[PDB]
Amino acid sequence: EVKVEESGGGLVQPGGSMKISCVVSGLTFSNYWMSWVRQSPEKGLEWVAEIRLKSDNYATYYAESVKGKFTISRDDSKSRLYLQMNNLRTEDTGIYYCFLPMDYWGQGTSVTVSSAKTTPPSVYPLAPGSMVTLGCLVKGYFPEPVTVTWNSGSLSSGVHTFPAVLQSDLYTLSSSVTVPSSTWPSETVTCNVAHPASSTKVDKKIVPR
Amino acid sequence: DIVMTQAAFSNPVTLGTSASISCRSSKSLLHSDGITYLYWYLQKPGQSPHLLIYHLSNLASGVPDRFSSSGSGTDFTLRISRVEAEDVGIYYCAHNVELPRTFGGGTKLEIKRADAAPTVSIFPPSSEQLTSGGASVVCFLNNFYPKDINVKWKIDGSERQNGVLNSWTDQDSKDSTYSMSSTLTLTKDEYERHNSYTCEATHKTSTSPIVKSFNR
């Protein structure tokens, strides 16, 4: 039905600019108020900008925390909402969601504001020296996020991925998969890792040692 | 400005019994039109927020009738009557009476379930990592309950402390368990100066640790 899908996130240096967007389907975009809400661990959910309709002369509103720095706009013809962000600071790091008050949220796009450089992950297989537990170690990347899937997202049961831990400007995480020993290694188990910031896509097959 | 206040946590709730999450506002959300403009959102682990309740008591489309909400202009209560494992997540209150739009800090629902020992797996460094000059030893402590747990590393029998990084999952939406990874990271050079590598998991489910080891 209603689908809200953000894009444009990434890394930028303090003082820099970024423009993010989202496109909405399954409703008539031009009839809905649009806003941006960001989320971070230290501050929670924070509404930052909102735009009204053509009939309201596209009236805009901003949180005090960002007024002067953010500009919200919409292209009704493309069903696309934008957020232009200037003089970004590290505190502006977070997941930015399109939020159509009050009913709909997007998937989020991640924005990192940092002087550290983008670095792609190194992906390593975790294979053992009824059931068997395998894994992938995803090491040495910046910024977040990565996505980890197994057998291109097909293998979904018995999976969990651990939160990344930052050390020394680089993140490491691992993902765990538990399958019947009748299924591996007789059939293949492959972890798929994507780090969009470095535009990296890596598949690592787990092979017995 | 309106401040929405809710507790970060709630008492762990047994499956099939009721949970109750509170919120309060700094200003009445009861409008002259008779509607109390109070909303509840759930954010399940790894997901976006989704609307549960609008206008204080009305269920969003698809939301189970296990969910219900009541309140005044300033004090509100979300009730989940017979909690399921799928219900874990963070529940946020919000108002719709003014800009800025503000949210509560979120209340995390935890499920109390039967104690479960971890399943422990240890993994030697990959040949790829070794080629690169690195050596990470990984221990998974999977699907245990309750959340508290301790891991100890040993190298050739002696406790090793530094170079170890730990990470804990959120409570699982299917089995209500927790998991933890512990990673010991060494240089290839240091790794190849020792032979035996051990991780030991201590959990309330036994007075003995669960010990996993390999020989290089």
Side-chain angles (χ1 to χ4, degrees), chain A residues 2-209, chain B:
Chain A
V2 173
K3 293 172 188 208
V4 180
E5 170 157 17
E6 299 93 335
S7 61
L11 177 79
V12 63
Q13 304 75 29
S17 298
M18 183 171 281
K19 195 183 199 181
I20 60 172
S21 69
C22 72
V23 51
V24 183
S25 60
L27 54 66
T28 304
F29 177 95
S30 54
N31 292 163
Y32 285 82
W33 302 350
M34 299 278 154
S35 73
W36 289 98
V37 176
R38 64 192 188 178
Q39 191 168 38
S40 60
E42 43 272 283
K43 275 278 168 164
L45 287 171
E46 177 178 11
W47 172 93
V48 293
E50 183 154 323
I51 190 161
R52 305 294 169 80
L53 310 184
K54 183 173 163 186
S55 51
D56 309 304
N57 285 154
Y58 295 122
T60 62
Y61 307 96
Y62 298 97
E64 287 295 313
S65 61
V66 306
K67 75 172 190 305
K69 280 166 53 165
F70 289 11
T71 301
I72 192 177
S73 61
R74 65 192 296 153
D75 184 342
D76 287 342
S77 76
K78 297 176 189 175
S79 292
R80 197 158 273 281
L81 177 68
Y82 303 97
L83 189 59
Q84 176 65 55
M85 323 164 67
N86 297 311
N87 183 33
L88 285 164
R89 307 314 309 182
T90 60
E91 53 156 24
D92 298 305
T93 297
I95 311 304
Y96 287 67
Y97 294 99
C98 288
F99 172 56
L100 281 61
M102 299 293 291
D103 298 323
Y104 312 105
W105 293 79
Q107 83 215 162
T109 190
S110 181
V111 171
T112 296
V113 184
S114 181
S115 59
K117 290 294 212 187
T118 294
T119 305
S122 292
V123 183
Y124 303 127
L126 301 178
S130 177
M131 306 292 295
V132 57
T133 293
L134 308 174
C136 270
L137 176 64
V138 185
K139 187 161 184 66
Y141 67 96
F142 188 87
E144 283 261 75
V146 292
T147 56
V148 181
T149 62
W150 290 94
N151 287 349
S152 316
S154 294
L155 201 177
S156 57
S157 173
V159 174
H160 49 255
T161 298
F162 296 95
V165 174
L166 187 55
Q167 197 178 69
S168 311
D169 306 348
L170 299 173
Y171 287 101
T172 302
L173 69 66
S174 48
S175 183
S176 180
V177 63
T178 298
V179 300
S181 58
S182 52
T183 61
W184 183 86
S186 64
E187 306 289 340
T188 64
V189 173
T190 293
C191 82
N192 324 103
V193 180
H195 188 230
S198 66
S199 284
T200 46
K201 257 163 157 141
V202 175
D203 302 324
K204 181 50 65 175
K205 188 171 149 187
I206 315 303
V207 302
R209 295 170 51 96
Chain B
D1 295 358
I2 294 170
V3 173
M4 305 298 283
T5 307
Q6 55 189 145
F9 307 110
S10 57
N11 292 2
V13 178
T14 296
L15 279 180
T17 76
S18 75
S20 184
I21 298 176
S22 294
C23 174
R24 63 186 179 79
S25 59
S26 61
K27 189 187 298 301
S28 183
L29 306 190
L30 173 53
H31 196 272
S32 69
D33 66 11
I35 295 172
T36 300
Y37 287 87
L38 180 286
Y39 295 65
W40 294 100
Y41 298 94
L42 173 54
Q43 189 171 26
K44 294 186 176 183
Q47 301 194 4
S48 304
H50 68 277
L51 179 64
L52 273 195
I53 302 294
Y54 62 100
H55 293 169
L56 187 59
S57 296
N58 298 287
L59 272 66
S61 181
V63 176
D65 53 36
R66 311 192 281 102
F67 296 88
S68 70
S69 173
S70 63
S72 66
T74 62
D75 299 288
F76 328 104
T77 304
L78 177 65
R79 181 166 169 274
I80 317 169
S81 60
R82 282 165 269 283
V83 163
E84 300 175 358
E86 74 207 59
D87 295 342
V88 294
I90 299 178
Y91 289 83
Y92 297 94
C93 57
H95 71 81
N96 182 28
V97 310
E98 71 167 34
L99 303 180
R101 310 202 174 272
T102 59
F103 301 85
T107 303
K108 182 178 283 166
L109 182 61
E110 193 194 338
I111 299 268
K112 188 194 193 177
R113 59 150 288 156
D115 293 356
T119 303
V120 185
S121 298
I122 194 175
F123 305 99
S126 61
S127 52
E128 291 92 329
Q129 191 181 18
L130 288 172
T131 291
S132 83
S136 293
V137 192
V138 182
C139 184
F140 293 155
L141 290 75
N142 281 346
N143 304 87
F144 58 91
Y145 187 95
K147 187 164 186 144
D148 273 67
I149 199 165
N150 277 285
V151 60
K152 183 192 286 187
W153 286 89
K154 296 171 175 177
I155 302 178
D156 285 346
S158 317
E159 179 170 346
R160 164 73 174 220
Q161 310 217 2
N162 319 296
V164 173
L165 280 179
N166 298 151
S167 186
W168 301 262
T169 59
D170 287 333
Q171 188 169 38
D172 188 71
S173 283
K174 271 77 210 76
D175 75 8
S176 304
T177 67
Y178 296 98
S179 300
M180 193 206 82
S181 66
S182 187
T183 304
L184 169 57
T185 295
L186 306 166
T187 57
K188 180 179 166 190
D189 173 62
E190 185 167 8
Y191 174 67
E192 296 189 329
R193 290 169 191 273
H194 306 284
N195 201 54
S196 141
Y197 287 86
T198 301
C199 68
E200 310 197 339
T202 302
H203 192 248
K204 77 173 286 177
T205 48
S206 181
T207 69
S208 286
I210 297 158
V211 184
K212 296 286 181 157
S213 304
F214 68 86
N215 301 303
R216 182 185 58 80

